[PDB]
């Protein structure tokens, strides 16, 4: 189990560890987050007290070096850092733990949740969207946009999510318009899985960072990301069997996780009942029609 | 965007544009069976591709046969009227390219905006105008031409007949969609007004009888009337 140690908490801030979120207040004896699951990535994400603008965070994986966290006075932010002297660290690290001053990361043993919304989300294809090649971790905030939304400004700062454009010549081959147009198939199984994702994983891996990096930050971006990647599967005739139960599992620990009072801005009307009641899959999303139905039927 | 009375000039500058209407390309009639069940049967029609600058219409004639063995035909037809608008298109010389098309019905955006991805610099818009463009069948030589026609078929026509040599395109159109409009609403007495004096009669070359300035002025009078008489007629008024 993995260890954030925090050098300060001089400005008062909500703190997320994942699915999880803290108040630390101005100058209060914080120094860290302990017990962190090795297996998974994580985000360790922040909303100022003072200044509820911006949210913003980090992606890592504890299996690829030692991260703290300190506070920039200049920048005015928490920024994560990497710890190269090991011995060092762990000494920070005893210290702190001894002297109690960490909150733990508070994992029921019976509560698959984070790994459920993580299953295909791998740290080196986060380096790829989150392109910052010195670090081993990935900023991301509430106000970066993606390639696509900066193509309809600072390209070193986007989000290099996929492009989707249903009316795109990469969507529409010449000579079966109406056909690649009405069944989303070609565009799904030629283009993006055999073509750019390689497999169904990266496929996922993207549609469940999306859907993360909307949640956590608020990100609208990162929100039409996740939308096209399920409306694309729910508009193709065929698909995997494999790819369509495991999309409805993923879908499913998506709706489970969303904060109810948050549906009206994270959930897209159309798109929903689009892919639940009229698409070619509107029959194959049963665990994720039955909670959609039961958490949300206003939007329906 | 979309195309409305604000913007109604717009039709005649010098930017090339085109009306498409697709609402003549499927069309049925509905009967019994023997059994007593209900089929229909396709006959001919068109696709109504019309210059408002130049009067040139572009009549694409669709034949019966591009609906054997094919299902969901209301559908296929928005796709068919795309496929042969973007074909059309792409058989004229770039200097006669439109720079705008604009659809009548707001379900042919889609299929048309999917058919012109290679011309990402046509500019694909509906419009608020309610045009008349359904009554083209009720031109009698247009009729004519898609009943007749044993295979699929392209025909040239200008609509406004020699009008241009007299009038601007602004009042050709206006004549033009009055004309439509009041064989739309009734079209026994349309035929009738145009009809009525034999010493008027259609070029072999034309759409419209050879009216002069003030028989013109006369027929548009008699048509407001018509399209008046016909509204009281429906609502009681």
């Known amino acids: 189990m993995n260890t954030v140690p925090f050098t300060s908490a001089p400005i008062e801030v909500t703190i997320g560890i994942d699915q999880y979120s803290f108040n630390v207040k101005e100058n209060q004896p914080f120094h860290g987050i302990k017990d962190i699951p090795i297996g998974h990535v994580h985000v360790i994400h922040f909303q100022h007290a003072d200044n509820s603008s911006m949210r913003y965070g980090y992606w890592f994986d504890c299996r690829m070096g030692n991260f703290y966290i300190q506070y ?27 002297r109690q001053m960490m ?77 690649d147009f009405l069944d989303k198939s070609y565009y799904l199984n030629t283009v993006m899985l055999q073509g750019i994702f390689k497999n169904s994983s990266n496929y996922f891996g993207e549609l469940q960072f999306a859907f993360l990096n909307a949640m956590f930050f608020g990100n609208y971006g990162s929100s039409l990301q996740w939308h096209a990647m399920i409306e694309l599967i729910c508009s193709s005739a065929t698909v995997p069997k494999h790819m369509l139960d495991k999309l409805d599992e993923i879908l499913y620990y998506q709706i489970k996780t969303l904060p109810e009072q948050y549906s009206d801005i994270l959930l897209n009307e159309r798109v929903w009942n689009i892919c639940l009641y009229s698409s070619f899959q509107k029959n194959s999303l049963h665990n994720t029609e039955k909670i959609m139905e039961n958490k949300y039927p206003e939007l329906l | 965007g979309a195309m409305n009375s604000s ?58 046969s591009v609906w054997a063995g094919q299902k969901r035909l209301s559908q296929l037809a928005k796709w068919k009227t795309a496929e042969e608008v973007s074909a059309l298109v792409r058989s004229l010389p770039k200097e006669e390219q439109p720079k705008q098309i604009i659809v ?39 009729s004519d031409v898609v009943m007749k026609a044993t295979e699929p078929q392209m025909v040239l026509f200008n609509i406004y007949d020699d009008w241009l040599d007299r009038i601007s ?44 300035d003030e028989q013109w002025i006369t027929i548009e009078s008699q048509m407001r009337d018509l399209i008046l008489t016909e509204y009281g007629r429906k609502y009681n008024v």
Request: net charge negative; charged share 25%; with cysteine.
């Open chain 2, 104 to 142: 009548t019905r707001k379900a042919m955006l889609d299929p048309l905006e999917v058919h012109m991805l290679d011309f990402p610099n046509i500019a694909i818009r509906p419009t608020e105008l309610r045009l008349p463009f359904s009554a083209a069948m009720s031109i009698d030589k247009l």
């Open chain 1, 103 to 179: 909150v733990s990361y508070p994992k029921i043993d019976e509560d698959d949740t984070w790994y459920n919304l993580t299953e295909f989300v791998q740290m080196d294809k986060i380096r790829k969207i989150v392109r910052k090649d010195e670090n081993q971790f990935s900023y991301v905030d509430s106000s970066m946009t993606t390639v696509q939304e900066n193509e309809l400004s600072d390209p070193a700062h986007s989000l290099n999510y996929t492009v989707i454009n249903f009316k795109s010549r990469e969507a529409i081959r010449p000579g079966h318009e109406m056909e």
């Open chain 1, 72 to 98: 920039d006075p200049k920048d005015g932010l928490y920024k994560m850092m990497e710890e190269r002297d090991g011995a060092k660290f762990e000494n920070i690290v005893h210290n702190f733990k001894e």
């Open chain 2, 7 to 64: 913007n109604y000039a717009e039709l005649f500058n010098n930017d090339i544009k085109l009306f498409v209407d697709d609402t003549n390309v499927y069309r049925v009639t509905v009967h019994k069976t023997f059994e007593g069940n209900v089929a229909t049967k396709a006959i001919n029609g068109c696709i109504f591709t019309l210059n408002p600058k130049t009067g040139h219409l572009f009549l694409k004639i669709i034949h019966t």
């Open chain 2, 169 to 212: 395109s602004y009042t050709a159109f206006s004549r033009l969609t009055l004309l439509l409009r009041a064989l739309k609403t009734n079209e026994e007495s349309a035929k009738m007004i145009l009809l009525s004096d034999p010493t008027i009669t259609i070029k072999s070359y034309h759409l419209w009888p050879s009216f002069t």
